[PDB]
Amino acid sequence: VGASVTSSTHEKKSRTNMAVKQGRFYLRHNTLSEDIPIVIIFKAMGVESDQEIVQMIGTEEHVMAAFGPSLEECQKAQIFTQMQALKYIGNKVRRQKTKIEEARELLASTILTHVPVKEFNFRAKCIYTAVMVRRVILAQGDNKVDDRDYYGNKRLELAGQLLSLLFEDLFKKFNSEMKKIADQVIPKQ
Amino acid sequence: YISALGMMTRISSQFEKTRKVSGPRSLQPSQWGMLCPSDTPEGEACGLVKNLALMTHITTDMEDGPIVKLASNLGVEDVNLLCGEELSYPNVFLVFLNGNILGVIRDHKKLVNTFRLMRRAGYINEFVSISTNLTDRCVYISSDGGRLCRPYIIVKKQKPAVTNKHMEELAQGYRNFEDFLHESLVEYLDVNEENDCNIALYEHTINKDTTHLEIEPFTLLGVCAGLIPYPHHNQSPRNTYQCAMGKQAMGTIGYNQRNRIDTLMYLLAYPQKPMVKTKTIELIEFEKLPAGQNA
Amino acid sequence: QQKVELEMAIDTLNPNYCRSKGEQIALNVDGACADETSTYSSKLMDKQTFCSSQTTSNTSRYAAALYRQGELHLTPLHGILQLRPSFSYLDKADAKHREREAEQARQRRVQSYEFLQKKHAEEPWVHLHYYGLRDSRSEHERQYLLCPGSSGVENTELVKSPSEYLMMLMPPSQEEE
Amino acid sequence: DDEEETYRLWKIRKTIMQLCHDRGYLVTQDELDQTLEEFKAQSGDKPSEGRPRRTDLTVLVAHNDDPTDQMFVFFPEEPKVGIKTIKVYCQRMQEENITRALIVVQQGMTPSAKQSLVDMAPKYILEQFLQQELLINITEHELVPEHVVMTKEEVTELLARYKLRENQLPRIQAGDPVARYFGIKRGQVVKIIRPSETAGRYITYRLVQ
Amino acid sequence: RMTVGKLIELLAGKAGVLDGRFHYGTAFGGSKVKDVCEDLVRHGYNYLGK
Amino acid sequence: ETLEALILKELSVIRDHAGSACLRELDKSNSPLTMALCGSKGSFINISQMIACVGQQAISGSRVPDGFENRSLPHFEKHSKLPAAKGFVANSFYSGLTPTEFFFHTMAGREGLVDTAVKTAETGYMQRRLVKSLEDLCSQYDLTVRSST
Amino acid sequence: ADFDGDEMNLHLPQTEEAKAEALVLMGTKANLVTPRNGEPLIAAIQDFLT
Amino acid sequence: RPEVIQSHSIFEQGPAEMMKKKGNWDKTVDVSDMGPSHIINIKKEKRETDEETKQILRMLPKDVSVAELLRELSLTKEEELLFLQLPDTLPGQPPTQDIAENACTLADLTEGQVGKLLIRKSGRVQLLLGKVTLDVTMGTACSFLQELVSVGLGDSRTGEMTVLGHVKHKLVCSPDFESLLDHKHR
Amino acid sequence: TEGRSRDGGLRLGEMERDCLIGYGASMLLLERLMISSDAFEVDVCGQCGLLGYSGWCHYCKSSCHVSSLRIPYACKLLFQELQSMNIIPRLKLSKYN
Amino acid sequence: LILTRLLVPPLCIRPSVVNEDDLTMKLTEIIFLNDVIKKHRISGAKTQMIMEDWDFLQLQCALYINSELSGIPLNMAPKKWTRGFVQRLKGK
Amino acid sequence: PGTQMTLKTFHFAGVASMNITLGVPRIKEIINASKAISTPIITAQLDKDDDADYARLVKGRIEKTLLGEISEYIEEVFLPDDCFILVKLSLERIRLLRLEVNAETVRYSICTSKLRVKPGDVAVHGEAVVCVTPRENSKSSMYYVLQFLKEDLPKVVVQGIPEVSRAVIHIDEQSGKEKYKLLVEGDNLRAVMATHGVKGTRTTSNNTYEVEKTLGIEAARTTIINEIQYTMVNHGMSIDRRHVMLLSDLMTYKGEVLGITRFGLAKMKESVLMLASFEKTADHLFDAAYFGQKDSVC
Amino acid sequence: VIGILQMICKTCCHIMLSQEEKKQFLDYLKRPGLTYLQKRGLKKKISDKCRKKNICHHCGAFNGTVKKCGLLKIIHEKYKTNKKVVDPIVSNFLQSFET
Amino acid sequence: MLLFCPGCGNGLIVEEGQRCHRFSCNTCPYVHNITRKVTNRKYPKLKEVDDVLGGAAAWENVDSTAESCPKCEHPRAYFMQLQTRSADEPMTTFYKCCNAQCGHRWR
Ligand SMILES: [Mg+2]
Ligand SMILES: [Zn+2]
Ligand SMILES: [Zn+2]
Ligand SMILES: [Zn+2]
């Protein structure tokens, strides 16, 4: 089983994914070198105590028993503080203060983009990720796997919808070409 | 005429014939009332090209302000104030808005009913939908556009809201359809919202729990499928074959057909109108431009 | 930008305090013999710290209510804060270990974190005295919740009829067409 | 317990000796209908039976053509046979001056000895099996037809009849379980008699490769 | 193929032509065969079109 | 599944008995009956469906699965197992279907169209591979069959 | 084939050898039984059975 | 590693299991209460479920506003603190604040009596407030520690801080929308 | 050519080939697939094993070791392409007996 | 087995208008790159870009046979599909 | 006929169970001769069928069981000096279940790939209770490695031979003689046939590859013919036996079961041009050039 | 290319084999009716039986492993350090980078 | 089942460094030496034991009573039951008959 959301807005279309490959939960994203244990992400997010993380996930015996093995690997590593996890993420970044601030801005403005954060208060993203984790873990109890065909999840485009993007693209390119010409002419010619 | 008209109501698909999965080709119950069960192409494209029903609407983006303004008053608690433990209780429901978390609420029934009543009165736009999911204890509110709708007649305590006096008034011209909308006599329903309703089909099937009623069941079938007489007496594939072959019958194209110069055009000398006709034939004025003859 | 830093004493004589572990931690975090500016006075940790996080910018709609027999006394809140224990001493230990080991473009500094850190650092610190709940000072201060006055008074405000209230809390969608 | 181990011992003795008889070596008929109670009579109970010796047999010889040719059957006890053990059997073998031998392992035998079991000597060859396989004689199985190995004269007459070169015949893998059962080597042809659904019969031949 | 709808169409059209009526074959509705039989029989034809 | 099996057995019994009762009254010189008896077109199942009662509409060898949450359409109560709420059709093609029966019937029917559309690939590819593999074998004058070599 | 608008191709061999092979091996009269199991395929059809 | 084992399936004794397990776990050494081995029973570890912080011992229930206040006044009559939430704007208007239609909030109201709280038959509650009524309902249950504190900035250099008490419950006030619609038809 | 806008010509698909194999008619499919599609005549040098032109092999400059052959054009095109990719299909050929 | 010359296919297997066939385009770009590297090495410029030109010729000659190769780095990855020899031998 | 295939329903032996692959996918599975197939089936006979003796305990001994419900409860036994793991067993429930498990047999079962725990670490305190002593491993392990050693009740790795699950009804109608059978959903013919108390000489598997590997090539071809005929007659269609005989003989005349795929046809054949004419063209031609192979035209 | 490059010695340029193995393989190639599938099989066999030797018996010069290092780029591991005693051949190569 | 340190809120571990074992944190010096019992576990996991007794294993389990078939009733199938998954879930039973050429086996 796994979970994913295609967070897309007016600015860009992106995606994320979660895996349960071995028994512990990992977060996967194409921009990062490889997947990371979710507890590292939680500690990087701004919550430290393991009690609070388990509280966010749940308190029922089976849900926590299954979430159990997702934190001993974090315990094995020396990640107990926020900047430890930030350092670890900055170590695991891929490119097409880098060690800390780059990781912070990446995690703030690219992970689950549709969830807003303005003053670096990360509680909302914490809650959203926690509920997603609970969703995926409880999905194993009963095989009611979501069916993509259900017509509540379909949306229809139209002529005036499509044409708007095309006009926006053309207008932006027009302005850019004019900008280039204006820059080229005045200082030299 | 039908070949031209039916194209304006055709839906494509983004799967674009990539491979076989035995998935989105099949007919689902979720298409009730929105897409034509019969008018689908025969052959390799079967199921992947679809046509709209007769009584259907598409929504568009909304204000998004008053919804949150009202939600903050119905008693939804901010998520930042409380810790994550509360989500595990069996009596608290998440509230979303276009998938974005908005708060947590106790006793969701009051919230849902008040929201629906407020929308009916006229303080929330008629295309905003609110629905409940008991399995996950969530409440979804959607306001973006692109999702289908259908109007239904509201039912309360086993009597339809509309009455013969309203129909007499409409016939005389005292009122119009939007008057029915404003007086809380009919309302639109989305696919997600009608998951929570009990849509009585005919008046004589109304019972304690029914909450809406069908204006006209014959509008399930689309434009091209409304030419068949007695579609419900035929085995199903024959209706699809007729839907496919009605777009090719020779006939008349329009009154200006004698002035067009087009690559290829077929006409019939002495067309005749049908002797047994549907009501969709009268809606689209097919009898003025017939294609065929009585034998 | 209301925030607090609260310092909490920790018992050391009690057996559940692992003295060896505490000495190791103090050595890892504090100078071996410097002691001029030390997080702890002794060779073991004597205190632990808490930090606050603000919850919501606007708190006008929240109020603190004091119950009493036959009457309720309300008071607006000046803020709400969330307190957690702080693990910064591990960071301090790591920093000590590391120090033992060894025509400008358009501005975008507004969105940077260290900008906000600097802006917060602009504000000078304030130190507070403390009194516990056991102190009678608490009961003395408790008197201020009970506002005096006649039990039965017709308030001058609250003249709006329900129609006006509904208009007020549901403003028209469009101010002008 | 202490009967099921002896039950397995009795069954594998029956099957191995059926194999010996089919190969043509010397065997006595009275021993063929040996009963399980007869096995208990000739050998004690499990606590009184020592696996590595209590089933050893070498009396069988190729009496059909050369009574002087004798065969060895050995029964290791350890789950995986080691190099030192096979060395012990090989040195006892050299003491007795025979050419070929047979081994039955309980579970397996080590990769080093796996490699060693193919290059001990051109003059010597050793046969390896597992208890699980020998627990039933496949030649009695329903699906398996009758295989018959045939002499050089018969194969010469065969490929003189149909006018073949010997390498055009259909092939049977050298590692096939039935090939192992009959122990035939490369270059031999086996007649097969496939039973028709009717009283008739079909005859085909396969070449070992 | 079981297209009984064609049989009903033929009968209804025969009934309608003889007295100027246009009949309806609307989905889940339309003219019923029971009345069409009497429409046929009033004009001197067999009540089932044979 | 015990309940499902019992329901299916009883619905099949209903359709079979209705068909038999229909055929017993049917007179000779009946055209469907003549066509069915000589086998030139049709069969008794089509006759019984046209006259007496169409059957349980089954999808993939089972009753119609729910498309909404715990029900098939909003016109039926939640957690209903009644015969009609899972595709059973009590109406023959003579008397006509109701809207829900019409929808379930079309839902069951489209499966055949999709299956026929899909079938064009697998069997053709399998026959391609098989005929490529088996092409060379021939019967010789020795009564043998030999490969190309 | 079913005469619902179907189409069929036709070839004319251009040799005596091809003619003879087609006539003797592909003749319709020589192919009255299918080779899968030896059952007839060319026999009467609907409306010749009635 | 043994291979020949005689299986057993005849019935055995239960109390035999109990006695053997007793012998394997009832030889307690709890008397080892040395100075370094002492524990404060208050300082025990905690269950994650704050309501069930009873993992090792020494050897929330459904509620409604009317019943909660009834308990608060009949069984006990000591002072208590409550944390309640109010609608965005109160039914009043600014007290000559010179005015946009700025929201009327408790922070901008004068002291004195402001309204009445009503309990009616069948157990539902309203806050009669001027000419309107606000329904009252229970909020989400609370289990973590909350403390009510008053921060006195006595001087620009320093002040003082005194604890008042701990909160236990929440209340939510919401306008009665359908009542407003019924009064003022639309 | 392929269409009906241009004058056409129907196709002997990959399945009609197998049908004709099944009948066992060996000259008929030869006539269908070579004689009346692209029967082309080339000349091949047996000394070097690859084809020349006009009875002269430029690879050897000898006209005394060249013979004519009848071959479908598509096969000749295949040989040209293959030799272009540095896959050389050298030929051996003998008398027709 | 390592190539230093290429046979240019005859005209007849690449008609006048594909104007001209894409194999002709590939051949012309190869010879253009050859002339570039020759004259530039004779000029006596920097080594690394010489080796870069050699790599670019490597890649183009490789593409001339197969137009499907995928490991191409982004900054010179082809923008439009083209037919090599195998693309016109292989496939339906 | 494969194109004539209609994929009819109610092929589940008349009981709507054992959803074994049937139809064109079944023919594909048989023809490709893939080493691993879906829903393998094995059958066996014992001596007799119905009521009193010797039959169904064989099913009990062979088919699926976990460590599972034999323990009515599992709970900690911590104590000051040290801690260790306890296993309770329900021997009366086992008696009704009548499997030969006992404290000693399960004690033997432990230490099989269970991190080299010594027999001293695991002890039989009573005939119904068994206990295990945890130990530090030092490979990123500590005394609290208890969380890791929680590897006993439903799923890590187990005693016995895995891969034999279960089977359910498939009834008959002929009462002239009375005849029943055993169905095994597993992938091990050798173990099932070699085991005691079952008539080994009449155990057949529908996995052709397993049969070939265990009983030889002749049984393999016989099973291929039988499976083809079974599927063909089950769907309700006819084909002469000689065709399937020829197909099975072609598949198994090289000494191994060579499926009809690109690999199998490559192994069966040698002509370069034909191979390039079917599949994998460019690689075939380049390799042929590399070897300098000369090809005839036959 | 990389295949045949994985067999040749980079100093003497011959094959890595022993004389009797050469004799055995030549006799293996000698048998009549050599088949194409036999050729592929013995290709794999020769690859396996030749890749093992780190030195060949005519010169004894050590040759390392040949591995693809990039897209149409092939590298050899002769001058490669090892966890064991430092190879004499690579020691001089390492020392030669002073300038 | 899990515990958290009240001092700092983290998962604790068990270790021995003195005369008695103790429940200890690792970021704060909190120690709680254990001296009594606890009576709950994580429900461990070991896989499906199917063929450990396959065929006719130790005959000590010979039993007398058995059921009978509703159709045929020859003398050979004594009874059996087994278990489904784990500690606290039900135990299934199947009744199976076998002579040859069928597929009978009931649940
Ligand atoms: Mg047709
Ligand atoms: Zn030449
Ligand atoms: Zn050398
Ligand atoms: Zn801690």
From Swiss-Prot, chain A:
Subcellular location: Nucleus; Cytoplasm, Cytosol
Protein residues bound to RNA: R15
Protein's job: Catalytic core component of RNA polymerase III (Pol III), a DNA-dependent RNA polymerase which synthesizes small non-coding RNAs using the four ribonucleoside triphosphates as substrates. Synthesizes 5S rRNA, snRNAs, tRNAs and miRNAs from at least 500 distinct genomic loci. Pol III-mediated transcription cycle proceeds through transcription initiation, transcription elongation and transcription termination stages. During transcription initiation, Pol III is recruited to DNA promoters type I, II or III with the help of general transcription factors and other specific initiation factors.
Family affiliation: Belongs to the RNA polymerase beta chain family.
Protein name stated in the entry: DNA-directed RNA polymerase III subunit RPC2
Species whose genome carries this gene: Homo sapiens (Human)
Phylogenetic classification of the source organism: Eukaryota, Metazoa, Chordata, Craniata, Vertebrata
Location of this fragment in the whole protein: 199 to 395 of 1133
From Swiss-Prot, chain C:
Coiled-coil ranges from the UniProt annotation: none
Localisation per UniProt entry: Nucleus
Biased composition (Basic and acidic residues): 94-102
Modified residues (Phosphoserine): S112
Modified residues (Phosphotyrosine): Y144
Subunit structure: Component of the RNA polymerase III complex consisting of at least 17 subunits: a ten-subunit horseshoe-shaped catalytic core composed of POLR3A/RPC1, POLR3B/RPC2, POLR1C/RPAC1, POLR1D/RPAC2, POLR3K/RPC10, POLR2E/RPABC1, POLR2F/RPABC2, POLR2H/RPABC3, POLR2K/RPABC4 and POLR2L/RPABC5; the stalk composed of two subunits POLR3H/RPC8 and CRCP/RPC9, forming a structural mobile part that protrudes out of the core and functions primarily in transcription initiation; and additional subunits homologous to general transcription factors of the RNA polymerase II machinery, POLR3D/RPC4-POLR3E/RPC5 heterodimer and POLR3/CRPC3-POLR3F/RPC6-POLR3G/RPC7 heterotrimer.
Function per UniProt: DNA-dependent RNA polymerase catalyzes the transcription of DNA into RNA using the four ribonucleoside triphosphates as substrates. Specific peripheric component of RNA polymerase III (Pol III) which synthesizes small non-coding RNAs including 5S rRNA, snRNAs, tRNAs and miRNAs from at least 500 distinct genomic loci. Assembles with POLR3D/RPC4 forming a subcomplex that binds the Pol III core. Enables recruitment of Pol III at transcription initiation site and drives transcription initiation from both type 2 and type 3 DNA promoters.
UniProt organism field: Homo sapiens (Human)
UniProtKB/Swiss-Prot annotation, chain K:
GO-annotated biological processes: defense response to virus; DNA-templated transcription; innate immune response; positive regulation of interferon-beta production; tRNA transcription by RNA polymerase III
Outcome of substituting R26Q: In WDRTS; uncertain significance
Transmembrane segments: none
Sequence positions that bind DNA nontemplate strand: R116
Expression across tissues: Expressed in the brain, in the cortex and the white matter (at protein level).
Localization: Nucleus; Cytoplasm, Cytosol
Entry keywords, A to Z: Acetylation, Antiviral defense, Cytoplasm, Disease variant, DNA-directed RNA polymerase, Immunity, Innate immunity, Leukodystrophy, Magnesium, Metal-binding, Nucleotidyltransferase, Nucleus, Transcription, Transferase, Zinc
Domain of life of the native organism: Eukaryota
Binding sites annotated in the UniProt record for DNA template strand: R262, K280
GO CC term (a single one): nucleus
Record note on what altering D249N does: In WDRTS; uncertain significance
Primary localisation category: nucleus
Molecular function terms from GO: chromatin binding; DNA binding; DNA-directed RNA polymerase activity; DNA/RNA hybrid binding; magnesium ion binding; zinc ion binding
Region: Trigger loop, residue numbers: 1-27
Family: Belongs to the RNA polymerase beta' chain family.
Protein name: DNA-directed RNA polymerase III subunit RPC1
Taxonomic lineage: Eukaryota, Metazoa, Chordata, Craniata, Vertebrata
Parent sequence residues shown: 1044 to 1341 of 1390
From Swiss-Prot, chain L:
Residues reported to bind DNA nontemplate strand: K44, K67
Known tissue expression: Expressed in the brain, in the cortex and the white matter (at protein level).
Residue sites binding Zn(2+) 2 per the record: C9, C12, C56, C59
Localisation per UniProt entry: Nucleus; Cytoplasm, Cytosol
Subunit annotation: Component of the RNA polymerase III (Pol III) (Pol III) complex consisting of 17 subunits: a ten-subunit catalytic core composed of POLR3A/RPC1, POLR3B/RPC2, POLR1C/RPAC1, POLR1D/RPAC2, POLR3K/RPC10, POLR2E/RPABC1, POLR2F/RPABC2, POLR2H/RPABC3, POLR2K/RPABC4 and POLR2L/RPABC5; a mobile stalk composed of two subunits POLR3H/RPC8 and CRCP/RPC9, protruding from the core and functioning primarily in transcription initiation; and additional subunits homologous to general transcription factors of the RNA polymerase II machinery, POLR3C/RPC3-POLR3F/RPC6-POLR3G/RPC7 heterotrimer required for transcription initiation and POLR3D/RPC4-POLR3E/RPC5 heterodimer involved in both transcription initiation and termination.
Annotated family: Belongs to the RNA polymerase beta' chain family.
Name the UniProt record assigns to this protein: DNA-directed RNA polymerase III subunit RPC1
Organism of origin: Homo sapiens
High-level lineage: Eukaryota, Metazoa, Chordata, Craniata, Vertebrata
Gene label: POLR3A
